[PDB]
Amino acid sequence: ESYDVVVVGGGPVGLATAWQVAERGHRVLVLERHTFFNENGGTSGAERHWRLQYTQEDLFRLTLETLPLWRALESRCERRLIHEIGSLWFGDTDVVTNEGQISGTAAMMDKLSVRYEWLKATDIERRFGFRGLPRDYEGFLQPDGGTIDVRGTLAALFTLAQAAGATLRAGETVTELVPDADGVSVTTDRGTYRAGKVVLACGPYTNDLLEPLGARLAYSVYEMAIAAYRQATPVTEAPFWFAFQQPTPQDTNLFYGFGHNPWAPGEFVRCGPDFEVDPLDHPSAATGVADRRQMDRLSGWLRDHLPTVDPDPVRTSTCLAVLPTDPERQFFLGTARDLMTHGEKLVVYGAGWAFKFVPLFGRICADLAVEDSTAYDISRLAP
């Protein structure tokens, strides 16, 4: 069997890519090692944050061009996937984190004429329910940000990809890739394939396939804890929130949470720590069980600073975050041209907070896998 494009990985990025390749009239195969919709990779959980604001101007331009792609996808599947509950960023305004920097981002919103409300500690505590915040903590609320329905998005992409004619095959793991001048040989535990080009969208497993080709990307994998809490005190407004703080000697000291998912039953909210600590040597080392210390830190912080939730989690789980090792970079997206000979035959999406970009990254990987280039400016994201 041969295809114009073989996509390695059936997570959101691989499915969005396959949908775009197939809709453009090309033959595409998606190979997934486990099952579609699995909760063992970087896409576990029900919600992700959609935001317009970014500290880097190039990424801020990309969120603005991704918004219409989300609207188009919502119309295709007839389901609102983004719920604009608001994006609240607050804390130390100068600390640089993997989420960005508050002060630098506020400057960018002014420049791109994106609206926001500036808030002081007292305002944050009164309107949103936080307590005991250091008096100098400040931040902003960007009203157009919100929550993304993860499972609704995956179902939409899967359905769209299959309807467009993509071949979606689960339970098959790619063990080797060998690009050459005429295409790429793909070996799996089930068989062999030839592809015009291959899109690698395998999350934390990218280096397993790039290593024998003499390449390796500089990213780290973190098994982050996530937990659900019962909302004790009835809500006023409950946006997505991220607390920007200076790190401690033991961890990054960053926390975030969501208001109740508008599509879900009951009154639970999800919160978690954003700790870039204890990276995994290999994703196989993941335990699948929320780290005790991370959980203690999260529940402890919520206990003191967000009394609107009951501090004893109802459920806990994990998610594998894959982030560039270098804090100056946010994403790895492009081809492997500068990493190996014939690398232009390998398109790679390999690290970052990317769920918000799924519609865009799918279109860009599709552009690179079919026509050598894309109209979007992603020069800085090159691997």
Ligand SMILES: *Cc1cc2c(cc1C)nc1c(=O)[nH]c(=O)nc-1n2C[C@H](O)[C@H](O)[C@H](O)COP(=O)(O)OP(=O)(O)OC[C@H]1O[C@@H](n2cnc3c(N)ncnc32)[C@H](O)[C@@H]1O
């Ligand atoms: C962990 C996490 C991520 C996250 C976040 C909070 C946490 C705790 N919050 C985000 C947010 O608010 N907004 C945002 O934009 N992103 C946020 N993220 C990141 C986002 O979840 C990830 O960027 C996204 O889920 C990545 O999707 P992707 O499609 O790239 O990756 P994946 O879901 O891991 O799927 C890859 C698939 O590949 C399969 N695989 C792996 N190796 C193979 C081989 N060899 N052969 C075949 N298939 C393979 C994996 O079984 C997986 O399904």
